[PDB]
C-alpha cells in the first residue's frame, strides 16, 4: 500500500455522561461533577466552636429558667443554636411571650451570654417570694416555677408598692425579662395580691410600658385557667431600668449580659451531635466539601455552596468517548 499518518484524539473506558442543549446522555472522557450531594448526617461544630443544643428546651424555657432546663443554667460560648420543632419544655404557664421572634432573631447575632443577678431574690423583704410556685410548672414532680424570675405575692395581707431600679454599670447591653400574671377572678386576685386594681410599670430611656392584668374566665391549658405573659428589653450600657407595681408582677432576678456578638442562627434539627467540624452545616447534617453547588437542604448556615434543586451538574472537560 502506502505510508499513512492520521489525526485523532483520546479515548478511554470512561462511562461518565454529560449533557448539552442539543444532546442528552453524551459519554465523555473526563468530567467534573460540581453538584455536592453528600452530608455526614450529624450536627457538628463550626470552626472548632460547638453549638448550643437545647435538647427538649425552648429559647424561652431556657432564658426564663424552666426547672427542666437546668442543664442550661450557665452555658458557654456557641456557634449556633439548635431547637426542636416542638420542644416539650417551653413555658409552664400558658401565655404570650411578647416579640418572641424578634428576641429569637436577636440571638442570631449573639454568640455568648453572662447570666447576672440583677435584683436578688432575698431582697424582697415585704413580699412573699418563695411562694412563687405552681402545679402548672412541675420540676421533679413537685410544684415549681421558672428559676430566673420571681412570682411575688403578698406578705401578711399586704402587697406594698414595689419601686426598684437598676443601673446597668457594665459596658455590654444586657437582656432583662419580666412578666405579668393574669388571674382568673376577683377572689384569686385578692388572695394572691391583696390589691384589686393593679399595674406593672417598666421604664428605660426607650421603653415606657404599663401593663394591667386582664381578669377573666378561661379554658384550662395544662389544667390551668390562668395566664402569664412575658416581656423583654435590651438595657444599654449607662441606662437604668425602673419597675413599679402593686400586683401581679413577675420580677426579674437574673439578666443576661451580651458578650459576644457574631454570627449564628437557630436550626430546627432533630439530629444529634457528632463531635465533628464544618464551615457549612444544615439541619439534616454537616457538609465538608468544596464545590460551587449542593442540593442537600435550603436552610443552610455558614459559608456554603449555592443550594440548587438539580439532581445533576456535571461539566465535560475531556472529549466525546464512544467505542
Amino acid at each position: 500500500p502506502g505510508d499513512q499518518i492520521c489525526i485523532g484524539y483520546h479515548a478511554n473506558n470512561s462511562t461518565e455522561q454529560v449533557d448539552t442543549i442539543m444532546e442528552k446522555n453524551v459519554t465523555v472522557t473526563h468530567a467534573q461533577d460540581i453538584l455536592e450531594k453528600t452530608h455526614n448526617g450529624k450536627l457538628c461544630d463550626l470552626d472548632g466552636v460547638k453549638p448550643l443544643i437545647l435538647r427538649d428546651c425552648s429559647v424561652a424555657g431556657w432564658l426564663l429558667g424552666n426547672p427542666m432546663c437546668d442543664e442550661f443554667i450557665n452555658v458557654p460560648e456557641w456557634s449556633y443554636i439548635v431547637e426542636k420543632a416542638n420542644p416539650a419544655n417551653d413555658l409552664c404557664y400558658p401565655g404570650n411571650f411578647n416579640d418572641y421572634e424578634e428576641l429569637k432573631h436577636l440571638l442570631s447575632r449573639i454568640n455568648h451570654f453572662e447570666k447576672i443577678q440583677i435584683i436578688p431574690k432575698s431582697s424582697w423583704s415585704d413580699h412573699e417570694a418563695s411562694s412563687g410556685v405552681s402545679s402548672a410548672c412541675p420540676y421533679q414532680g413537685t410544684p415549681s416555677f421558672f428559676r430566673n424570675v420571681v412570682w411575688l405575692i403578698k406578705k401578711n395581707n399586704t402587697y406594698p408598692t414595689i419601686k426598684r431600679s437598676y443601673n446597668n454599670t457594665n459596658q455590654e447591653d444586657l437582656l432583662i425579662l419580666w412578666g405579668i400574671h393574669h388571674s382568673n377572678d376577683a377572689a384569686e386576685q385578692t388572695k394572691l395580691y391583696q390589691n384589686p386594681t393593679t399595674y406593672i410599670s417598666v421604664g428605660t430611656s426607650t421603653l415606657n410600658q404599663r401593663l394591667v392584668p386582664k381578669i377573666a374566665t378561661r379554658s384550662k391549658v395544662n389544667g390551668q385557667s390562668g395566664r402569664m405573659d412575658f416581656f423583654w428589653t435590651i438595657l444599654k450600657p449607662n441606662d437604668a431600668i425602673n419597675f413599679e407595681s402593686n400586683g401581679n408582677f413577675i420580677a426579674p432576678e437574673y439578666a443576661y449580659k451580651i458578650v459576644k456578638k457574631g454570627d449564628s442562627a437557630i436550626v430546627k434539627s432533630e439530629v444529634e451531635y457528632g463531635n465533628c467540624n464544618t464551615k457549612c452545616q444544615t439541619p439534616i447534617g454537616a457538609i465538608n466539601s468544596s464545590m460551587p453547588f449542593h442540593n442537600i437542604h435550603p436552610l443552610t448556615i455558614g459559608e456554603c455552596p449555592k443550594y440548587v434543586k438539580s439532581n445533576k451538574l456535571v461539566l465535560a472537560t475531556g472529549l466525546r468517548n464512544s467505542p
Binding site: 502506502g2 505510508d3 489525526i7 485523532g8 432573631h105 467505542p323
Partner: protein, 164 residues
C-alpha cells in the same frame, strides 16, 4: 473522525503513523496543553465567579404574620428558581462549547498537516492521509513539528502519482 484512539495515552490530541519502520502514536504537546489551559479556567471561572454567597439565614414568624411569612417564603423560592435555572443552562451551553472546542482543535491539527503535503499525500476522507511517497520516521516527525520539507518528495510524489 472515525472515533477516538483507545491507544493514545500520551495526550488529548495527536497522531498515528504507519510506515515500513512500523507504527506508533504521538500526542501533540502544544495542542493538548492549550486545551487543558482553556478547559480548566472555564471550570474555575464558573466556580470562582460564584464568590457571591457569604451569610445564611432561615426566619421565624407568628400566626398573625402569614403575609410576611409567605413573602419570605416566595423570596427564597424566587432566588432558588433563578439560581437553579442559571446553573443548569450554564452547564448545557458550556458543555456544548467544550465539546466542539475539541472538534475545532482536532480539525486544526488535520489542517496544519494538509497544508504541508498538498499533493504529496491522498486525503482518504477519514482523518488520515495516504502519503504518496515513502515517509520514514524522520519524515513523519517532520510533518508533526511543522518542519516538513515538501520539495524533497515533490517529483517522487508526482512520478508515483503518475503510476495511476
Amino acid at each position: 473522525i472515525e472515533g477516538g484512539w483507545q491507544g493514545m495515552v500520551d495526550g488529548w490530541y495527536g497522531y498515528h503513523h504507519s510506515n515500513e519502520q512500523g507504527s506508533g502514536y504521538a500526542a501533540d504537546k502544544e495542542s493538548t496543553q492549550k486545551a487543558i489551559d482553556g478547559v480548566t479556567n472555564k471550570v474555575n471561572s464558573i466556580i470562582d465567579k460564584m464568590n457571591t454567597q457569604f451569610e445564611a439565614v432561615g426566619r421565624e414568624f407568628n400566626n398573625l404574620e402569614r403575609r410576611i411569612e409567605n413573602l419570605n417564603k416566595k423570596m427564597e423560592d424566587g432566588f432558588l428558581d433563578v439560581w437553579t435555572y442559571n446553573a443548569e443552562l450554564l452547564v448545557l451551553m458550556e458543555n456544548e462549547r467544550t465539546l466542539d472546542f475539541h472538534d475545532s482543535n482536532v480539525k486544526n491539527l488535520y489542517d496544519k498537516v494538509r497544508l504541508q503535503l498538498r499533493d504529496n499525500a491522498k486525503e482518504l476522507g477519514n482523518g488520515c492521509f495516504e502519503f504518496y511517497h515513502k515517509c520514514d520516521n524522520e519524515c513523519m516527525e517532520s510533518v508533526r513539528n511543522g518542519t516538513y520539507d515538501y520539495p524533497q518528495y515533490s517529483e517522487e510524489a508526482r512520478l508515483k502519482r503518475e503510476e495511476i
